């Protein structure tokens with residue numbers, strides 16, 4: 001057993017929203033056994049000094065595109081709207097791949113770096129949505145991301161993605177990226193069989209993740225609806241990015257939500273990325289259907305899209321999680337940092353009603369329990385007996401946090417660095433003193449850097 | 454002499470916006486001797502390895518309220534409008550002060566912490582506007598802040614502030630903080646005499662900083678305009694916060710700008726904080742007058758105020774700098790971090806015109822050369838021969854910056870941490886390997902923390 005002793009603040013996000021001061025967390029294998037003051041060290045083989053730290057459930061990034069780690073801070077993509085951006089990303093990746101510079105082996109190392117960054121940022125679970133499958137067969141890109149994740153020990157969901165609707169029939173994408181629906185479906189069956197760990201504390205899970213309504217055939221959505229029910233896995237896609245509604249109207253004469261409903265995706269198996277601009281009238285429908293939403297403040301701002309109606313979602317009882325999206329539209333994997341963006345950027349939308357603004361605790365909740373609920377993980381996102389020992393802690397005693405009165409608010413509103421001090425995943429200590437304990441930081445940086453096209 | 458050799462990237466912000474790759478910076482005493490490739494280590498007594506770093510001019514925070522470091526992350530002040538905010542801050546400060554908990558000795562140590570954080574964030578010059586002068590006689594609060602700055606070796610401007618218009622006569626300021634105009638003028642003359650270093654590379658400078666049009670008598674603005682001419686010092690105040698226009702109309706029947714023009718402040722001696730909501734038709738007048746503007750994205754968002762027309766200011770040729778404001782409305786002193794906030798938050802105002810969005814380079818210029826210009830420092834903000842050796846460097850080779858293609862954009866758009874690697878002020882190395890060279894960080898944290906009310 002591992003005991004973390006004397007934590008300055010513990011934020012549980014349990015059913016009573018308990019917080020604790022000068023308290024401990026006891027860990028046994030993959031699970032938390034207790035959270036409380038003065039815990040017994042009866043069967044403890046390692047005690048860790050938590051004094052001066054705040055502990056949270058591990059952050060859960062409910063929407064990544066790991067392969068975009070290779071596409072950060074490209075000058076031509078700095079100030080572009082969505083259409084120019086998407087063309088630029090697809091063209092570059094197709095180009096690099098054609099030149100033998102962007103195969104699964106490269107993606108493995110890009111994923112390794114972004115996932116290691118994730119750990120160092122206090123993120124203990126990542127859900128990646130990979131759609132890049134050039135060629136006549138589905139290559140081992142997902143396997144590569146899973147290999148990277150398992151090597152590091154980070155908890156991992158892979159939402160296999162695609163672009164199955166070609167520009168020829170209304171899609172905004174070139175037929176290079178277009179796979180036949182059956183190829184995608186066949187591949188997903190194999191991935192579930194090979195990799196999916198459905199048991200509590202499972203470390204790898206597969207989800208089914210079409211790129212979206214403007215990008216994938218209705219047939220794929222329906223196939224995935226059937227597959228998700230048959231294999232009890234979850235469903236993920238992009239949702240109400242601006243312009244989606246125009247494309248859905250043109251192709252189908254219905255809204256993106258009506259499309260999802262029609263093809264089996266109005267269900268509690270589903271989590272939806274962005275949800276920036278839904279018709280206000282559909283929000284109660286999202287609630288009744290039990291879909292979950294991941295707030296992605298950084299890309300929404302970066303693309304000029306604006307502010308998703310998160311307060312409205314919370315008012316409606318809709319599950320809200322948080323994510324970063326890929327590093328071509330962020331351009332980092334810093335989830336904690338993005339929370340500050342949301343905390344501040346939402347405010348000018350309601351200048352005279354501060355009670356509507358998202359709070360630090362609401363945001364931290366989204367990034368832990370909310371994201372856990374998005375991923376369908378009742379075993380994560382909460383520091384309590386019986387849940388997974390996924391824990392992230394930050395030091396409170398730096399010169400840049402002097403004068404902080406509330407440590408949880410302080411974690412979002414102050415600081416020069418979002419680097420976690422101590423990070424535990426599945427009961428395994430992976431970060432200590434802001435450094436990886438098992439991963440070779442310098443070698444990983446060197447190896448991945450050598451592979452960036 | 455000191456040679457920084459082999460910097461991966463150097464951003465000069467010189468008159469041709471030169472950048473250099475794999476280049477050196479040579480320093481002699483307080484000044485830069487040369488910037489370029491393979492510089493001679495002739496009289497060099499020390500060579501610093503710059504490989505893997507990006508170098509910029511030191512960041513210059515053109516608007517601080519250091520004493521607010523003690524008022525961070527207060528739950529009751531997390532989500533409040535300006536009115537409630539001002540109420541909460543003035544009550545706490547006056548209340549702590551009355552109880553002997555907020556004297557110059559406390560402010561000295563709060564300033565010491567925030568200024569040390571500033572150095573660690575790559576900030577080499579700070580302009581503080583101390584707003585708390587309880588009792589008719591302003592204590593040695595300004596002396597306290599200067600003492601802290603000089604102990605640390607950070608370059609420092611102290612804008613002596615005031616609240617000369619009391620509510621006892623149609624003003625908005627409590628009588629506890631209201632000083633007779635001549636008393637303020639006299640304190641200012643005493644400060645210039647004791648502290649002001651007008652020579653190039655001067656490390657302490659005095660500025661004259663009324664709280665604002667709603668808060669100070671016309672006679673003070675005029676007296677200051679006179680002092681500014683007499684002593685070649687600069688003038689600083691708050692400008693076009695929401696509600697100012699109404700307060701100005703109510704008291705004087707004219708706009709805040711019209712009022713400044715009337716009382717001698719429409720000149721190239723002036724820099725103005727926020728400038729969030731000016732009438733568009735006055736912008737050309739700002740340009741003609743030659744006033745400079747400090748953009749403060751964090752408090753503007755935190756208060757729910759929204760987006761200052763920065764693109765318009767740049768279009769008009771108006772000098773634009775950057776600052777954080779005080780830590781009661783931020784709540785950090787992390788200037789680099791705030792640049793990312795600006796980079797993203799401005800975009801949704803112009804969804805379809807990305808050319809209007811502020812670029813990384815425009816924002817970094819604001820935080821260096823722009824801020825130097827605000828402060829009237831032609832000796833700062835540029836990495837070139839003859840300017841001050843104020844330099845801030847960040848490492849580029851961390852796992853969180855793998856895949857970055859343009860290091861300057863990457864400084865804004867990526868990272869778990871804004872901590873600077875190497876910081877030089879006045880030719881003195883003050884931060885190296887992300888650690889203070891001379892300052893005792895642990896002792897400073899302990900001492901200041903003990904004094905937080």
Ligand SMILES: CCNc1nc(NC(C)C)nc(OC)n1
Nearest residue numbers: 065089211212238299325326329
């Ligand atoms: C195409 C629908 N949306 C979308 N897709 C991505 N990424 C992939 C191309 C990997 N990133 C964003 O960021 C906003 N939006």
Ligand SMILES: [Zn+2]
Nearest residue numbers: 238273325326
């Ligand atoms: Zn996405």
Ligand SMILES: [Zn+2]
Nearest residue numbers: 518691726778
């Ligand atoms: Zn201010």
